[PDB]
Design a protein around this nucleic acid. Structure first.
Length: 436
DNA sequence: AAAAAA
């Protein structure tokens, strides 16, 4: 049933629903034929999760590789995240015959870099086959779910949402899940509902899952934050149909601008959110918008994230990162994006002699674009100049604040800029030149 | 305007 292992090296696609067999059954089969298999997954919890199931399901303790915990068993099957895979330097010389790239539809920087690394090192590493598995191939469109009945919203309601309202009785009793785009609006919506006597709580990246009562009436207003260690299944799901993403704009003021904005959800988003209900029983899905943008596309800002991660985490030169990204963008059947490898590469190539301390800080802070942040900070300190602003993203320069004065040598815009700006800095001129 | 993995 699973893709046949070719005599020579080949890259195969695995389009199939139900996120289970593709990461358990498929690999279990290959191993039965005496093959060494590597299964990569974006999630750490998922990767650790497959370890426990494989044992009890196929009586074979697979190897587990994640940033937190690593476990070797010599077994023919190894489960690992893309992150951990990258940190391990990629494909080991002759370690696996088949490499499975699960959730290959994910457009996050780590997965794209990961898959691109596989597509470039697989064959040489000795692998005989690469599998790009996903339940939602590029260009997918949400399909009506059996145990789920979708219903639109209207002005009819006492709780304003995103252009509409939500009936009080619609969520009066039972367990419900409300999806909001912003983390602050989650606390707002939850505030009102809970204020109306309703038992509503907010959830997002940071708060522990223990906040949501495993039983009893409750309304959860959360973001797309993964509820690791929590049995989903909700009587209904109200979705705002909006996703928060980062977009890049070549505003030439003086160079580029990376900002996080909103945007209508795509098939994947819609599917995943609507999937939190209708598990084993009839569920409901209340939306604010009927349409949906086709899945399979990601912004150029993501490639920028790849070069940043290659620089900050995986000790990859800009050119090296390009090899792996070039392989990704040259492989059909995967998420597409405007080819800006050359431009992004040239940008990062000029970002030399970064302050190790600042880099360490931005990385440890778990901030976005830690490399670009730390580098801007480096230029600022090197010029005894203040950062673009004193927003939390520049906190690595706080101890130097007393001695920083004058215009910020702006290299690019990563958020709001409060301080005065100058564009005379050599690195800024270099970047301006790349824009051409 | 969020999340996630290094």
């Amino acid at each position: 049933s699973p893709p046949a292992v070719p005599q020579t090296f080949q890259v195969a696609h695995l389009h199939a629903p139900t996120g289970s067999g593709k990461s358990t059954k498929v690999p279990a089969a290959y191993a039965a034929q005496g093959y060494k298999v590597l299964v990569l997954n974006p999630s750490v919890a998922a990767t650790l999760g497959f370890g426990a199931y494989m044992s009890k399901a196929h009586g074979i303790d697979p190897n587990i590789r994640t940033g937190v915990r690593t476990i070797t068993t010599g077994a023919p099957i190894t489960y690992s995240t893309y992150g951990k895979f990258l940190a391990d330097g990629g494909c080991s010389g002759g370690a696996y015959d088949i490499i499975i790239c699960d959730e290959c539809h994910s457009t996050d920087s780590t997965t794209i870099l990961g898959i691109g690394t596989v597509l470039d090192q697989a064959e040489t590493a000795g692998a005989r086959l690469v599998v790009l598995a996903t339940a939602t191939p590029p260009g997918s469109v949400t399909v009506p779910h059996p145990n789920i009945e979708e219903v639109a919203l209207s002005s009819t309601g006492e709780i304003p949402f995103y252009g509409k309202a939500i009936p009080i009785e619609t969520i009066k009793g039972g367990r419900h899940l409300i999806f909001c785009h912003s983390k602050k609006k989650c606390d707002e919506l939850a505030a009102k509902l809970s204020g109306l006597g309703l038992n509503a709580v907010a959830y997002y990246r940071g708060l522990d899952v223990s906040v949501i009562p495993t039983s009893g009436d409750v309304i959860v207003v959360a973001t797309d934050a993964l509820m690791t260690g929590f049995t989903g299944d909700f009587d209904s799901v109200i979705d705002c149909n909006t996703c928060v993403t980062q977009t890049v704009d070549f505003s030439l003021d003086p160079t580029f601008t990376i900002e996080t904005t909103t945007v209508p959800q795509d098939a994947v988003s819609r599917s995943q959110r609507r999937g939190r209900t209708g598990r084993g029983r009839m569920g409901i899905y209340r939306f604010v918008t009927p349409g949906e943008r086709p899945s399979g596309m990601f912004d150029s800002s993501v490639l920028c994230e790849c070069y940043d991660a290659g620089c900050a985490w995986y000790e990859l030169t800009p050119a090296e990162t390009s090899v792996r990204l070039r392989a990704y963008l040259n492989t059909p059947g995967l998420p597409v994006c405007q080819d800006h490898l050359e431009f992004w590469e040239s940008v990062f190539t000029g970002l030399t002699h970064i302050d190790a301390h600042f880099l360490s800080q931005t990385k440890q802070a778990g901030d976005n674009f830690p490399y670009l942040v730390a580098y801007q900070a480096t230029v600022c300190a090197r010029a005894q100049a203040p950062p673009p602003s004193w927003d939390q993203m520049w906190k690595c320069l706080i101890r130097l604040k007393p001695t920083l004065h004058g215009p910020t040598p702006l290299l690019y815009r990563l958020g709001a800029v409060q301080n005065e700006v100058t564009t005379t800095h050599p690195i800024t001129k270099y970047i301006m030149a790349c824009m051409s």
